[PDB]
Amino acid sequence: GVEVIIALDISNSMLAQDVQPSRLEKAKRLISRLVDELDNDKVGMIVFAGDAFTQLPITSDYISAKMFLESISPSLISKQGTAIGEAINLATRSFTPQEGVGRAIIVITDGENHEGGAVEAAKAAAEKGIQVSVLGVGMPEGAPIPVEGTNDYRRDREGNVIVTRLNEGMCQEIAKDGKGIYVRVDNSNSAQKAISQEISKMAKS
């Protein structure tokens, strides 16, 4: 039995629709399916934008895990930014006291505009027997972010349309130093299958 903590980016950029139906909703589908492949394991979830917080404390209750998953939206966090380092640090503190267990942190993000700290956070996790993997959601080419109520798109401080890009290089550096894997999430089931197989390989270690 292993412990998996998901660190899900819920910043505004995750509402981009360059993966269907959006980055965030694709990420929630993948998590749900990830949970379905778990056996006698425990799963927790952190959400982050400018801050990070524990959305789901580490649990074997998969029915509740899916209900908590389905209620996630960017409105859970008002402060904006991409605080991957804080999320990883929170996750490392969020595992159970048991020794001898395989432990994974799965960061699901577009990796965009992270100031600094994720790489070190991932390094610190790795040296505590935790493997940090990153699932990169979005495309490097860039997409605008639709606004639900209106017919407009998200705008920066100056009032210009925001184009958000997947930053794969950032995602890759985190995963390398966190001793996990990186995979790009696209419309297929490829990312979910790749991370699920990394989980169950860790389980048989």
Q: Which residues are annotated as a binding site for Mg(2+)?
A: 11, 13, 110
Dmax over CA atoms of the chain, in Å, equals 53
How far from chain centre, in Å, is Cα 122? 13
| Helix intervals (H) in 59-110 | 62-70, 84-92
CB of 177 to a copy of itself, least distance (A): 30
Instruction: Please tell me whether residue 75 binds Cl ion under the rule CB under 5 A.
Output: no
Q: Residue 151 binds which entry of Cl ion, a copy of itself, Mg ion, none, with Cβ cut-offs from 5 to 8 Å by kind?
A: a copy of itself
Residues 123-142 interacting with Cl ion (rule: CB under 5 A)? 142
CB of 172 to a copy of itself, least distance (A): 21
Nearest one of 57, 40, 51 to 6, comparing CA atoms: 57
Instruction: Please tell me whether residue 155 binds a copy of itself under the rule CB under 8 A.
Output: yes
Among 143, 166, 170, 202, binds a copy of itself (CB under 8 A): 143
Residue 39 burial (C-beta neighbours within 10 Å; 0-12, 13-18, 19+): exposed
Structure tokens at 7: 């660190």
CB of 159 to a copy of itself, least distance (A): 5
Q: Is the dihedral of CA 188, 64, 71, 1 positive or negative?
A: negative
Q: Phi first, then psi: what are they for 51, rounded to 5°?
A: -120, 170
Instruction: Please tell me whether residue 161 binds a copy of itself under the rule CB under 8 A.
Output: yes
Instruction: Please tell me whether residue 11 binds Mg ion under the rule CB under 5 A.
Output: yes
CB of 14 to a copy of itself, least distance (A): 15
Q: State the residues that interact with Cl ion by CB under 5 A.
A: 12, 30, 83, 85-86, 116-119, 142, 154, 160, 163, 189, 192
